[PDB]
Amino acid sequence: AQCSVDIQGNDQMQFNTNAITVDKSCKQFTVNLSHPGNLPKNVMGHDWVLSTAADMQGVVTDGMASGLDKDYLKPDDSRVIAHTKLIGSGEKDSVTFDVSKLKEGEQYMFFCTFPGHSALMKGTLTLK
Amino acid sequence: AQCSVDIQGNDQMQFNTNAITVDKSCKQFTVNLSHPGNLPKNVMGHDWVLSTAADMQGVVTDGMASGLDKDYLKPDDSRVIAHTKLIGSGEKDSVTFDVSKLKEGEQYMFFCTFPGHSALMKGTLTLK
């Protein structure tokens, strides 16, 4: 626990939280994602992606343009600090990243890149 | 216009009108739906479905459970007064229903039954 969190994205297009603070003593931080529900990945896919607030739009945009095969993310997009894979119902994925990639005083947002899902599936992350 | 309306569902999960009025003189009424943009049916499908405000949730829940192959609508759902098929970008569909299936003093709702979309895509229909 402490440097980790569990996120669930369901069939009603929602995440279970919209805010995450990362404790400044963490060297690394883990996100674990599971998709409750019965719908397939091609109709209700979810991933947890991270970037600063000012680049979220660019990532969602470039992400949509790359297709379901690239899990709706642009390959080697250097605005994406961290990201999971796109997962369907009953699947799960985890990502660990380096906390020194964040700095205190900058605003970060987590979100899903499936088309349209970022309207309700988005939230803040902050280094405290 | 005269006893019919032309409506659009776009790539942002938005319909372009959110209240429809049906005048009592009309024996029938027609709705013509188009979907501008470029996303396919499985990622951004849309339909126009009508029920009383009371049956919307029962219809939205059963439709999600019917699958993309059943155009996310329960077959022969007795609560649906009228509907179109589920279209992707570039496509189009229309429907004409009898105005005698509506009654004065009841509240009706139109919505898209694609999973996750009916929260953003809905509006009122009133018989005046």
Ligand SMILES: [Cu+2]
């Ligand atoms: Cu999603």
Ligand SMILES: [Cu+2]
């Ligand atoms: Cu829709």
